[PDB]
Design a protein around this ligand. Sequence first.
Ligand code: ARS
Ligand code: CA
Ligand code: CA
Ligand code: CL
Length: 322
Amino acid sequence: VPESHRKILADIADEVLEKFYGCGSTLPADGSLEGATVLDLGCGTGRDVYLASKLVGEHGKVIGVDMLDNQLEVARKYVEYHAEKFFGSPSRSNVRFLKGFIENLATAEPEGVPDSSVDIVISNCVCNLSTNKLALFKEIHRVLRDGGELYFSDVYADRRLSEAAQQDPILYGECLGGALYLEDFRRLVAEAGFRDVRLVSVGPVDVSDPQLRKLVPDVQFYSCTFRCFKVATLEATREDYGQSATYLGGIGEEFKLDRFFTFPREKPVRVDRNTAEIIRHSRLHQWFSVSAEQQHMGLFKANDSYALLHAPLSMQVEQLVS
Ligand SMILES: [As]
Ligand SMILES: [Ca+2]
Ligand SMILES: [Ca+2]
Ligand SMILES: [Cl-]
């Protein structure tokens, strides 16, 4: 738990913390959250929705979605509580909780999530129990506005699991059985409309039970945090148009977009055009200066890890854990 969140969680209702299902949804840098609309898929009792509530401030909004009756009941009891806590009045809530399958946000209750209405979709470990990943990714793409991002953590595999592993109920409940191979994930999310997957962080996930490991003997599992922007002008490849981006300051000493691009305050950093377009069309533009496109210069190589930048996801992930 990041320090900047600790004081806010101390202010969140003990019943929300005590009954919360799962691990916290990871968030983009606090400063970038100001005024955003955030949607948490599988919000549980609302721990992350309330944390985001504060971080987005009074001009932001947070929406939580879940299908667990008891979780939501708890969530919905503390709306006034946290409005008082954060904003000073019980009537000043910027959160709402909706009941529904994450696969179809359009028909949640009391209301659905409309097209192009969300800046950030967050979630932690929801995909491998999803009933239909493609449909889930398509629904995320639908609700995001242009320049919005899916910023999420989940478990992935370095190879395709066997049928036997995919049928095992303990592997399934542990979010391993339903894990995609990293390249299959890349193709699936691209079919849903996310043409550029950026690796934020990765940790190893171990299967130590020797019985279960026999179903996935040499499989390496990872918990990966990815950010996938919805930006109309993204291409499948990372092309150089001679651009630089300069982080202007104001949401930290430096801005780390992903494991390839770190932007120190007031220093120009060469960027491929996808990265430029992400900065320009997303909410991040507020804190950046991005130079004009020149003539195409070929594949983007002005990065000290440009080889890995263009490589398959499995190589990026495997090398970042090293
Ligand atoms: As999970
Ligand atoms: Ca959750
Ligand atoms: Ca491997
Ligand atoms: Cl899990």
